[PDB]
Amino acid sequence: WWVVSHEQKLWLPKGELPYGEAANFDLVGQRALQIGEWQGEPVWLVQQQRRHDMGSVRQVIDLDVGLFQLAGRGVQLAEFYRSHKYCGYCGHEMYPSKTEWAMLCSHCRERYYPQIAPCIIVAIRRDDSILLAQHTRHRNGVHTVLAGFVEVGETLEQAVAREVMEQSGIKVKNLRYVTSQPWPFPQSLMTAFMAEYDSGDIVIDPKELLEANWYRYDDLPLLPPPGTVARRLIEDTVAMCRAE
Amino acid sequence: MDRIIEKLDHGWWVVSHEQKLWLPKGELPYGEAANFDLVGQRALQIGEWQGEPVWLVQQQRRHDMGSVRQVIDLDVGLFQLAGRGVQLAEFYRSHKYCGYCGHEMYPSKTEWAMLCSHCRERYYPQIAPCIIVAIRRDDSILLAQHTRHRNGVHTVLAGFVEVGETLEQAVAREVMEQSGIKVKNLRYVTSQPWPFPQSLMTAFMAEYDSGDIVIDPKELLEANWYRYDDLPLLPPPGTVARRLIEDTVAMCRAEY
Ligand SMILES: [Zn+2]
Ligand SMILES: [Zn+2]
Secondary structure (H helix, E strand, C coil): CEEEEECCEEECHHHCCCCCCHHHCCCCCCCCEEEEEECCEEEEEEECCCCCCEECHHHHCCCCHHHHHHHHHHHHHHHHHHHCCECCCCCCEEEECCCCCCEEECCCCCEECCCCEEEEEEEEEECCEEEEEEECCCCCCCCECEEEECCCCCCHHHHHHHHHHHHCCCEEEEEEEEEEEEECCCCEEEEEEEEEEEECCCCCCCCCEEEEEEEECCCCCCCCCCCCHHHHHHHHHHHHHHHC | CEEECCCCCEEEEEEEECCEEECHHHCCCEEEHHHHCCCCCEEEEEEEECCEEEEEEECCCCCCEECHHHHCCCCHHHHHHHHHHHHHHHHHHHCCECCCCCCEEEECCCCCCEEECCCCCEECCCCEEEEEEEEEECCEEEEEEECCCCCCCCECEEEECCCCCCHHHHHHHHHHHHHCCEEEEEEEEEEEEECCCCEEEEEEEEEEEECCCCCCCCCEEEEEEEECCCCCCCCCCCCHHHHHHHHHHHHHHHHC
16 A cells, blocks of 8 residues: 655545555655555555645545554654654754654754644533534534544543533533544544533534534434444434433 | 733742743742742743632743652642643743744744744644553452552553554553453543643553463562552552542442
């Protein structure tokens, strides 16, 4: 597998992740780093830009989960190296380590390691209903649960409460951890919670959400596809709402 | 809040540099800026505690710069804010120049981020997810003594989460690598930001399933099962490690 990546995009001839060999992809004489293995065969990363067919990681989301994770990991690793061409501490140019995935500074002892951004996702239940919302940046017509990034100095539970307050203005109680899941393109670790309505009315921040409302277990809108963590949280919340 | 300290400013003062903070007499400064020679310095409000603002000052003092571990006896909420200041100061120092283009960066005033004057790129503080698990075998708890620090404290197992790994996978891999044990009934309990240097601890409880205790002499001196009511020296209150131990003990007390 050949993952040719640049500026958070990857080369996708015809929408396909390159597979086969370098002679047919103009990788002859270029540098490549083996980043993984899928179906018993190596997966390669090439830091090179292409005149046409460069594409985002979302386009290859329909692929095998192992292969999708590996392709996005390569994109993140190429972006990691791009993000630390210069050392943040002193400004001098850096170079990649030959022993581990990291950047070393030519001038000072400091170094960088790939960032995993911890984040939360939470389904809020109010009696017979669940809070679902559409996003302003991703106006795909799908109603889903709330999510956000964990900040320095807060717990996963504090991140949930803050993000719900910022995005919808609701106070929640009885947080319950369900599961967790690694997302490759932006590298991050999402943790899944369930929550119960405590108090407050829906006030949305338009710069994050297009709309939000309480939807009854017997009246659900367009939901995330089965197999996603968001849909699992919704299905577990709805099962409980139906049961109660 | 980002501004220069005046004459009438007061609160909690986190003066931090190179993973340390100023702890005169081992205490977290509290009071008027005039009493700490902070008037005229740049400070960032990083939170507030019981109605008083908590300020971050990026400054190295000649003396009494130590680890935030020394104020672990403060209230958890305040300790979290003290750790936030230390982590934020290290994050700002690490992003003086933009990694993508080399140009000087400036702090965002709407969020904890560094923005580039020349580029469109930005950076957010790096937080390393970690798992910590208390393993229970009937009326006993697994406690381990670290070779790296011979402090006599016995504690639970912990490790960094690897790339492309779930929290549950990390617990299974870390427990197997450290002790050679397989666990069952894994249950998440809580999380704690641990600024040593920038970890986010996720706390689990688990029960012994199978496997023999096989440890690395280079990393652990010993690992033994201790009965819930007869435990050895433990890590002090304020650590999520102690919370897992106490919650495990409480479960044993309820069942036995
Ligand atoms: Zn440097
Ligand atoms: Zn830049």
